[PDB]
Amino acid sequence: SMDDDQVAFSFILDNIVTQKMMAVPDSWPFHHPVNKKFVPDYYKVIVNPMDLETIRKNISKHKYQSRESFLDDVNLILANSVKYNGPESQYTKTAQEIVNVCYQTLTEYDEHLTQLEKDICTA
């Protein structure tokens, strides 16, 4: 893209993913789409899969103009884990830690992200 406000917004989101979310201990199973060779029934159970690589690909294509659409996809990782792995699964706890570091970092960056969202919107 050529709009610096959008590029900057996407860059901030990408670093939330790589610096914070992917740093959660044992988070690797959420870094990429579920591998059907190891989890053979995953895509028969989960209608709308989501993972951090897919989110990063969306960021690289500037598909998030607001934090809410980005957070919606992050939240879907957890919701899918509740459904597939179970509400109390070790994997679900890890997914919630991923969500928590994302949500809390977005809160940290609130003033800066608000400014970018309004400058992406005006254009």
Add this chain to the structure above:
Amino acid sequence: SMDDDQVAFSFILDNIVTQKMMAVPDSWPFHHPVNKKFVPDYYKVIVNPMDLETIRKNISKHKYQSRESFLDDVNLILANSVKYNGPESQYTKTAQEIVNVCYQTLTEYDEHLTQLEKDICTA
């Protein structure tokens, strides 16, 4: 109760529910047990219902001595929504905002809550 550490702990939890969780936009359907008159099959699907009023009643009776038991009931609200509404439902997104703001507020009060939990345990 007559134990000030327990009363203070419950008071803090109660304000997380009323000041943050119940302030989530459009969260009213989670404020009370699901009304079977509008959702007639709810209690045939959901074996362990949970809602914010029930959690507040538990808090008033000092049933939570630690964040973990409190979070177990908070997360159950989300688990029930994933099962009944689905991982991508608007209602599940609302439940996730409730859960996410709860974790974020607990982190903000972490030093205060850790001290109270450790003083409740000694007795």
